[PDB]
Design a protein around this ligand. Structure first.
Ligand SMILES: O=c1[nH]c(-c2ccc(C(F)(F)F)cc2)nc2c([N+](=O)[O-])cccc12
Ligand SMILES: [Zn+2]
Lengths: 162, 46
């Protein structure tokens, strides 16, 4: 695929700033933990840098196109993404197969400021049937994975959602 | 996969009832995101 994963040391400032964004963006959810489980914080086991020259060049090419359409402003954010397809995404990148057809804003690829929102999708839409080992959406044993992603928003359409 | 609204590159879902919720975002081109960090974790029992 061209992807390598580089482990960050817990002593690395990059590990610490990514952990803080993960921990500080947990909130309570309206489902009382049905989809993502009941928790106020995470046990971070590992943070890896995803390195793929081809996928990076694909991202920066698109970022330049957006930027030139928006007064040299990519409007780049760092956002969470939870998906049952996290292992396909890190190897092949995001594409239409990672879209949420039934999402509130139509068939697209959804990202969250709240790490706990992305946590609700790790085991599928609405948490699916939870961890594959115990069938538990609130499993405290099984290892979970989230992506912390660089996202070009450019000119974003504001939808107020009551 | 749908298109972003005409003249736009993304959609922002602004929290509008839950005062504590942060924004959600939607892109319609896979090229507009790079998966920079893979975080392995457990949720912790309160
Ligand atoms: O991180 C997020 N991931 C997903 C998601 C949805 C569906 C799929 C799947 F169909 F491919 F399985 C995979 C991931 N949805 C989110 C939403 N949302 O409401 O869609 C809001 C905020 C963040 C996320
Ligand atoms: Zn489990």
């Amino acid at each position: 695929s061209g992807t390598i994963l580089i482990d960050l040391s817990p002593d690395d400032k990059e590990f610490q700033s990514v952990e803080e964004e993960m921990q500080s963006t947990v909130r309570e959810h309206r489902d009382g933990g049905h989809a993502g489980g009941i928790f106020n914080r995470y046990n971070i086991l590992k943070i890896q840098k995803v390195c793929n020259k081809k996928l990076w060049e694909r991202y920066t090419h698109r970022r330049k196109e957006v930027s030139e359409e928006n007064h040299n402003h990519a409007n780049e954010r760092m956002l969470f993404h939870g998906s049952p397809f996290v292992n396909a995404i890190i190897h092949k990148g995001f594409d239409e197969r990672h879209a949420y057809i039934g999402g509130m804003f139509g068939a697209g690829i959804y990202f969250a400021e709240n790490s706990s929102k992305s946590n609700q999708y790790v085991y599928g839409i609405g948490g699916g049937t939870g961890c594959p080992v115990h069938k538990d959406r609130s499993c405290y044993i099984c290892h979970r994975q989230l992506l912390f992603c660089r996202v070009t928003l450019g000119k974003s359409f504001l939808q107020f959602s009551a | 996969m749908a298109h972003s609204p005409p003249g736009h590159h993304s959609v922002t879902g602004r929290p509008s009832v839950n005062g504590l919720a942060l924004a959600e975002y939607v892109i319609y081109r896979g090229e507009q995101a790079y998966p920079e960090y893979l975080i392995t974790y457990q949720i912790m029992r309160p």
